[PDB]
Design a protein around this ligand. Sequence first.
Ligand code: PMP
Ligand code: PMP
Ligand code: GLN
Ligand code: GLN
Lengths: 410, 410
Amino acid sequence: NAKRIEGLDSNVWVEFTKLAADPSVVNLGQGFPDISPPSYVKEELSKAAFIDNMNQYTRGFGHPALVKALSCLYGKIYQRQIDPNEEILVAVGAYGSLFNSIQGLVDPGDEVIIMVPFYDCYEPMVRMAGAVPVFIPLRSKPTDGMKWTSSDWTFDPRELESKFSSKTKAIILNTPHNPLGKVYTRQELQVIADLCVKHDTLCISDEVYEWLVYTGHTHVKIATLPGMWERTITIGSAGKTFSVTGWKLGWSIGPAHLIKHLQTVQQNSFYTCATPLQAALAEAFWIDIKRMDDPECYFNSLPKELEVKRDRMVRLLNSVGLKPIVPDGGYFIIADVSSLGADLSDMNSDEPYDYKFVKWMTKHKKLTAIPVSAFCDSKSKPHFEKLVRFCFIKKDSTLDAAEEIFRAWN
Amino acid sequence: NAKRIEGLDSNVWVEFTKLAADPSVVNLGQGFPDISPPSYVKEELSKAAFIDNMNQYTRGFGHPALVKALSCLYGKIYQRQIDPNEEILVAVGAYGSLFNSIQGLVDPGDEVIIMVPFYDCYEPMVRMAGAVPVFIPLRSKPTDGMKWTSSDWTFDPRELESKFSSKTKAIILNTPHNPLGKVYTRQELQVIADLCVKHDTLCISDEVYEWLVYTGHTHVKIATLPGMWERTITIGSAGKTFSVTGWKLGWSIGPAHLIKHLQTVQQNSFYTCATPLQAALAEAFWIDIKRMDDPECYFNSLPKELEVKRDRMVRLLNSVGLKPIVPDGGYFIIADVSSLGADLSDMNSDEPYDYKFVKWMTKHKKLTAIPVSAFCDSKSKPHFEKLVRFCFIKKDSTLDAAEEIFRAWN
Ligand SMILES: Cc1ncc(COP(=O)(O)O)c(CN)c1O
Ligand SMILES: Cc1ncc(COP(=O)(O)O)c(CN)c1O
Ligand SMILES: NC(=O)CC[C@H](N)C(=O)O
Ligand SMILES: NC(=O)CC[C@H](N)C(=O)O
């Protein structure tokens, strides 16, 4: 192995393969939608398949009709003109966008601030770049009494500030947050923005779940706050927006002077993304862009549908004594499992509690989930290891099977 | 920009975004097939599109049906049992496979040997890894007097040996060769094998054009030579194999102890490739794998169809005083351009001779092509700068438009 990848060969997802290959297990762990994607998304891909040209090379930095649809949709959200060619880069998922961003912008010995828990890829991407991840946790605060929510988690602005130094190149922001479901507030973003401007750092903002925010909350884009446009890369994903995780297309949106460096990594790595997927996606966008104010727009109908499933899930977790944290956004929910005081007596590894719990739940109850300590750096693990993450982008019948397990639990 | 991409922002193909544009020009430049993909390749993509699961995330290192198909096909070629999970990585094109190999295997300060002319991405990919490209040119031999062919180019084994030191990490091999169409001989591969074994170096073998070898030549895989399986990564491409360049799926095949490091790059960069493309590509493979014996197999029928088109191009180029180098393989043909009359003081730009010629032929003859100096490091360019490359993976009607241009040349 090359030095840049020393110790980066472990991967939580490669780790979690085994859990649910067993067909009789209900899998609420990985973010695999088993709802149907919209009919027209599948239709448009079939249509593109039969056009010879759409099966040949397209523009390296993104299919022209696609980046054009992206600049239209995001121009409305940002309330500014987005340049399709210079301010957008289409990459292989939000992963590939994150990869372009760190690879083109982050040097060895640079510091990168990461909020804990974090989508697991952030830490190894920062390391393969020779950079130093700097961790800060989200801490709970007292609850309103009736409900535990994502909004009861936040950061200490004084603690955040202390993480910023002359070596900080960037901070990574994930809102709506995976695994917590947190929708960052304008006040939180403002504290983040103040510091990035004051230290002259970048913000890389992972916003794949941007459409999935629930009543009481709103997606705010940090790159729309004063001084932030010039210093933010904001990332979206086809998989999340159209429920086609398997298309693996995302985009980075930001200023031309930053996006050019992302574009230089891409030209020198995989170069271009698939033409047929990008062609179909452009069409899907236009179909929904043109009804953005209608309920039937997929940007509106999916979170509306997911809010119902979310609520059903919180009731299911409650019925067995799991303390759910009701998410403001996204399609994951965390439950504290410690009030079950489960029977993990003879799992004798040095794994965190949540991993043992999940292995135990899979074997005994036939239900899998993801340990939140998978989204934590070594020192943070003991502070989050009683927490397990459940996925609810699932068809009713799947959540029915889940309900059968919760009803039979004792 | 990050330091790692310093000076790597210029891209040959980004630059040629000049006169491919104008409507009336016959483009024989970029490797863009304008023939149809096989009908079943297209139908299989349409069918995967309508299966919901084929739109969601698949195995990270390659869709299981696709790695199994590639296992079975390549295991016949190699006469060995290839492990589909450990000895194969599906990536985003041959580009992505090349990136995985260099990123996962090559350190700052390593030397990487590259044979000139080289497919252009080799050099910046080695520079991005902090390594030193060590150039050796292919050189001409006396012809049989009758015709000029790719096999009249070779390398000096003694000069190659002198490129190997204790800093050498690897040699990049490209057979059949782009741009010049060379199908490296068993005796050439043996000289490279002897030196990788003696120095304990890697060979990264880029064999995207492996099926496209014409009469009197045989694709031989260096990884099949004694002692080479354990030091070789061999790369393939869907875009070349099934004439669907826009699908951006390639693969690396080789021993587990090397493939795992490519796997580590990929899990940390883009992770997963697209599911519907991989599903459809697995089915396109099973179809052709079952009929390898038969002339109807795409592995057989395409090289046959293209050989006719190569022979046509060589007649058309001869017709106008461009001396073609007849390719053993691939879908590019170089023509020597020096026996024509120049223009070219209307430029004076002292950029290479071939770049001036290609601008002159675009403007005045309405035909584009690629200057060979684009595939050459700085010191080599004077040895190759009268050479121009043409693509013939084109429909009959495109080649007729080309015919009409040659007919009207004088
Ligand atoms: C926060 C976050 N970022 C990025 C991704 C990956 O995005 P993509 O599938 O487009 O590569 C995910 C989905 N696993 C995610 O939850
Ligand atoms: C020799 C060679 N290797 C790799 C590639 C790129 O392969 P892909 O399109 O699958 O990424 C090309 C482009 N045709 C090539 O000519
Ligand atoms: N590698 C994957 O597909 C994992 C993604 C899934 N959304 C997760 O966060 O759990
Ligand atoms: N998209 C591309 O860069 C096409 C490259 C093509 N194979 C060529 O060599 O001309």
